[PDB]
Scaffold this active site. Structure first.
Site, PDB file in Angstrom:
ATOM      1  N   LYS A 187       2.143 -79.578  46.725  1.00 54.42           N
ATOM      2  CA  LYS A 187       2.144 -79.322  45.015  1.00 54.42           C
ATOM      3  C   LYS A 187       1.740 -77.421  44.465  1.00 54.42           C
ATOM      4  CE  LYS A 187       1.476 -83.234  43.493  1.00 54.42           C
ATOM      5  NZ  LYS A 187       1.537 -83.331  42.119  1.00 54.42           N
ATOM      6  N   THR A 210      12.761 -85.064  14.226  1.00 51.90           N
ATOM      7  CA  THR A 210      12.685 -84.517  12.988  1.00 51.90           C
ATOM      8  C   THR A 210      13.510 -83.585  11.957  1.00 51.90           C
ATOM      9  OG1 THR A 210      10.888 -83.780  14.280  1.00 51.90           O
ATOM     10  CG2 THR A 210      10.487 -85.608  12.563  1.00 51.90           C
ATOM     11  N   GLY A 268      17.269 -70.230   4.779  1.00 52.67           N
ATOM     12  CA  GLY A 268      17.355 -71.554   5.340  1.00 52.67           C
ATOM     13  C   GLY A 268      18.377 -72.069   5.294  1.00 52.67           C
ATOM     14  N   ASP A 294      18.185 -73.727  -2.676  1.00 47.91           N
ATOM     15  CA  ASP A 294      16.730 -73.803  -3.463  1.00 47.91           C
ATOM     16  C   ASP A 294      16.806 -74.098  -5.081  1.00 47.91           C
ATOM     17  OD1 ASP A 294      14.641 -75.211  -4.537  1.00 47.91           O
ATOM     18  OD2 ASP A 294      13.505 -75.305  -3.348  1.00 47.91           O
TER      19      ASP A 294
END
Length: 325
Positions: free
Chosen positions: A63, A92, A180, A183
């Site tokens: 490695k 999510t 974003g 609201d």
């Protein structure tokens, strides 16, 4: 630091091998590999001089000389990626998929944009529209388009009934350049914290916006909260304007500026303001502002006819919204 890249490589490998693998035996191994390399006083140039050390088996020696060559490790990539965690917290992103469902989909094999786009029978309507517009809901909205979205909603509402009050909050009211989503907080004098509970006050506004083709989809319509999808009108423009997230909350008249304050926010400002209230003896809340008595016994909601009222109570100067970072 000499090696360091090598030891962070081995430490993360050990951790994984004990909290995913459960092979505490090879966790114990990498641990030994790492301590030694850290002892060794010279910079590892290759994985053979790096093999010649008392606790570095040739698997590991294979490695190191690699990480030295590529500046990375594929086993770490195919591990960081599949992280049972990191998948949940991706699914999510899709509006409509929280923790509970994400965990289901994930450890049942589905965790990427395309895995999803290959089983919509496992999704409800919210999750579906959220998928269709994944990329769209991922973009920002220029203050410019938001102003236009403000006008559509604002005038449509006043046309229905002039007694409605409607204020867009969020990063938009704080004078931001980019948002974003949108609201909206809505109230009406016929609806107070003592009154019946009037879902039509909200429904009537939502349906009027769909009627004129602003709102394009419903993800969740509740008695007091609607969340959906909206879009600015166009011409012959291909993808003209993407679809945005819009939320519409209905609030009793007598606790509206509590909700407006709260939803204009910045959480850091909400945190500081409540905390200041709690020091002059008030509790602020997204609904009310109450004296805080002897102990934590809250008194009666005080009259709030404006944001200014909330500031006066805690002895603060009114902070312009632009000024609530």
């Amino acid at each position: 630091t000499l090696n360091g890249g090598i030891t962070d490589m081995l430490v993360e490998l050990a951790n994984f091998e004990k909290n995913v693998s459960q092979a505490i035996h090879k966790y114990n191994a990498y641990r030994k590999a790492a301590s030694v390399i850290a002892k060794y006083p010279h910079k590892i140039k290759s994985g053979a001089e790096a093999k010649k050390l008392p606790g570095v088996g040739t698997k590991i020696a294979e490695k190191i000389d690699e990480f030295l060559a590529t500046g990375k490790l594929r086993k770490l990539e195919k591990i960081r990626q599949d992280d049972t965690s990191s998948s949940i917290n991706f699914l999510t992103r899709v509006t409509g998929i929280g923790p509970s469902a994400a965990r289901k989909l994930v450890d049942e094999g589905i965790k990427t944009l395309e895995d999803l786009r290959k089983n919509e029978d496992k999704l409800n309507h919210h999750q579906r529209i959220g998928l269709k517009y994944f990329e769209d809901f991922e973009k920002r909205i220029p203050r410019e388009e938001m102003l236009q979205m403000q006008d559509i909603v604002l005038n449509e509402v006043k046309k229905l009934d002039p007694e409605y009050i409607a204020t867009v909050c969020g990063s938009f009211r704080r004078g931001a350049e980019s948002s974003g989503d949108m609201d909206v907080l809505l109230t009406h004098p016929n609806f107070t914290s003592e009154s019946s509970k009037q879902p039509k006050l909200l429904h009537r506004v939502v349906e009027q916006l769909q009627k004129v083709r602003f709102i394009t989809d419903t993800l969740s319509k509740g008695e007091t909260k609607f969340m959906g999808v909206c879009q600015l009108p166009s011409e012959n423009d291909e993808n003209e304007y993407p679809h945005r997230r819009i939320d519409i909350r209905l609030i009793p008249k007598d606790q509206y500026y509590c909700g407006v304050l709260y939803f204009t926010g910045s959480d850091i400002f909400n945190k500081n303001m409540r905390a200041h209230a709690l020091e002059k003896g008030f509790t602020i809340n997204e609904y009310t502002i109450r004296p805080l008595g002897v102990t934590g016994v809250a008194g009666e909601p005080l009259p709030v006819d404006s944001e200014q009222d909330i500031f006066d109570y805690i002895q603060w100067r009114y902070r312009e919204p632009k000024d609530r970072s």
